[PDB]
Scaffold this active site. Structure first.
Site, mmCIF file in Angstrom:
data_model
loop_
_atom_site.group_PDB
_atom_site.id
_atom_site.type_symbol
_atom_site.label_atom_id
_atom_site.label_comp_id
_atom_site.label_asym_id
_atom_site.label_seq_id
_atom_site.Cartn_x
_atom_site.Cartn_y
_atom_site.Cartn_z
ATOM 1 N N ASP A 1 -23.264 -25.360 45.885
ATOM 2 C CA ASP A 1 -23.934 -25.495 47.310
ATOM 3 C C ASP A 1 -24.005 -24.222 47.842
ATOM 4 O OD1 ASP A 1 -25.413 -26.944 49.206
ATOM 5 O OD2 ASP A 1 -23.770 -27.871 50.016
ATOM 6 N N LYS B 1 -25.476 -21.462 50.127
ATOM 7 C CA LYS B 1 -26.410 -21.022 51.084
ATOM 8 C C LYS B 1 -25.983 -20.406 52.244
ATOM 9 C CE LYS B 1 -25.206 -25.878 52.663
ATOM 10 N NZ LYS B 1 -25.908 -27.227 53.294
ATOM 11 N N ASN C 1 -23.119 -21.578 54.291
ATOM 12 C CA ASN C 1 -21.827 -21.805 53.422
ATOM 13 C C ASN C 1 -21.277 -20.249 53.334
ATOM 14 O OD1 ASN C 1 -21.517 -24.283 53.585
ATOM 15 N ND2 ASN C 1 -22.225 -24.699 51.625
ATOM 16 N N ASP D 1 -16.810 -24.035 51.712
ATOM 17 C CA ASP D 1 -17.593 -25.488 51.378
ATOM 18 C C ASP D 1 -17.415 -25.763 49.966
ATOM 19 O OD1 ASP D 1 -18.684 -27.681 52.445
ATOM 20 O OD2 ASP D 1 -20.761 -27.032 51.955
ATOM 21 N N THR E 1 -28.101 -28.708 48.425
ATOM 22 C CA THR E 1 -28.793 -28.637 49.464
ATOM 23 C C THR E 1 -30.437 -28.547 49.024
ATOM 24 O OG1 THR E 1 -27.193 -27.905 50.818
ATOM 25 C CG2 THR E 1 -29.532 -27.393 51.539
#
Ligand SMILES: Nc1ncnc2c1ncn2[C@@H]1O[C@H](COP(=O)(O)OP(=O)(O)OP(=O)(O)O)[C@@H](O)[C@H]1O
Ligand SMILES: O=C(O)C[C@@H](Cc1nc2cc(Cl)cc(Cl)c2[nH]1)c1ccc(Cl)cc1
Ligand SMILES: O=C(O)C[C@H](Cc1nc2cc(Cl)cc(Cl)c2[nH]1)c1ccc(Cl)cc1
Ligand SMILES: [Cl-]
Ligand SMILES: [Cl-]
Ligand SMILES: [Cl-]
Ligand SMILES: [Cl-]
Ligand SMILES: [Cl-]
Ligand SMILES: [Mg+2]
Length: 284
Positions: A130, A132, A135, A148, A170
């Site tokens: 995840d 991104k 994060n 995260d 995501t």
């Protein structure tokens, strides 16, 4: 073992769907921490126990400057507490929103730090899954602090595991292999890396639509293009990361790892050693 009364709490730094991160000062040491706090009742009732355990396990393995550090954990009757390093400058996303488009040097600097971080993580057999801008936090010196890890995955060396089956991520950054083969792998993070590089320059990530399903459809068809003036060396790099075949992405194991990725012309000027000690270019 630390206790809640060992700290004075300050402002709330942020709220998740099942967590609250608060700034805290430890009375005995005067040190600052970001403490992530979860309600036991809410975690149990809402099936989040595996994510909390996962986050603790993964973070306990991490010992690198580009990652948020887990210093300690404790609990009382109602709550679980994670003591984390405080990233005083917040999420990278907020800077992308404010500025719209990073110049080439800032793009290269943050891309390089993310590449360095991913080299370390994958070297430990861990997939983030995840990755991104939300994060990727920024410390007081504006170096990255990736966070995260509740949906990260420790690949088992015992079975030479390469693929993971949990559906996490995501939509804007999720990899085609997860959507079509229903598995993720280290290379899935490299797909996200490509989306992030693109977003640093273009303001918005490459697969653009107003809901998750529409985005999923674009990802599997590799439906995106580059805006004008996208830095050519950056464009080439992105095109070598956003490849549907996960075994053909620059940096992936089948492409012989991070050596060729760090050798890409985009990073020509980069000194990879002691990257975390270099003064970062100004955003802004
Ligand atoms: N170590 C940290 N330093 C500074 N701020 C942080 C830190 N960790 C988290 N935050 C802030 O707190 C917010 C909530 O983080 P948390 O991981 O508790 O939930 P989340 O993952 O954002 O929410 P969700 O679970 O819905 O995805 C984040 O958006 C982030 O901006
Ligand atoms: O090592 C410790 O301190 C205890 C462990 C064990 C632990 N106790 C729990 C109670 C509940 Cl209700 C839920 C989870 Cl996920 C729980 N995990 C723990 C404590 C705090 C945190 Cl954030 C995670 C795990
Ligand atoms: O990417 C983010 O989540 C940050 C935001 C909001 C935003 N994110 C988007 C992602 C997509 Cl794929 C499409 C639109 Cl219209 C989106 N709008 C944003 C808005 C404008 C700018 Cl210049 C940068 C970031
Ligand atoms: Cl800002
Ligand atoms: Cl997703
Ligand atoms: Cl796969
Ligand atoms: Cl090139
Ligand atoms: Cl480094
Ligand atoms: Mg989180």
């Amino acid at each position: 073992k630390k206790r809640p009364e060992d700290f004075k709490f300050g402002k709330i730094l942020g709220e998740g769907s099942f967590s609250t991160v608060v700034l805290a000062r430890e009375l005995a040491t005067s040190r600052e921490y970001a403490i992530k706090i979860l309600e036991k009742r809410h975690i149990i009732k809402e099936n989040k126990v595996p994510y909390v355990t996962r986050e603790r396990d993964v973070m306990s393995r991490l010992d690198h400057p580009f990652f948020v550090k887990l210093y300690f954990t404790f609990q009382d009757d109602e709550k679980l507490y994670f003591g984390l390093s405080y990233a005083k400058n917040g999420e990278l996303l907020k800077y992308i929103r404010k500025i719209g488009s990073f110049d080439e040097t800032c793009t290269r600097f943050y891309t390089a730090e993310i590449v360095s971080a991913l080299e370390y993580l994958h070297g430990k057999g861990i997939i983030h899954r995840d990755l991104k801008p939300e994060n990727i936090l920024l410390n007081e010196d504006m170096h990255i602090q990736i966070t995260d890890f509740g949906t990260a995955k420790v690949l088992s060396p015992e079975s030479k595991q390469a693929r993971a089956n949990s559906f996490v991520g995501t939509a804007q950054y999720v990899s085609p292999e997860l959507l079509t083969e229903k598995s993720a792998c280290k290379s899935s993070d490299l797909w996200a890396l490509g989306c992030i590089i693109y977003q640093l320059v273009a303001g918005l990530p490459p697969f653009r639509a107003g809901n998750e399903g529409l985005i999923f459809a674009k990802i599997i068809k590799l439906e995106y293009d580059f805006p004008e003036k996208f830095f050519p060396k950056a464009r080439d790099l992105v095109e070598k990361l956003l490849v549907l075949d996960a075994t053909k992405r620059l940096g992936c194991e089948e492409m012989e790892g991070y050596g060729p990725l760090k050798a890409h012309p985009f990073f020509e000027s980069v000194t990879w050693e002691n990257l975390h000690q270099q003064t970062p270019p100004k955003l802004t």
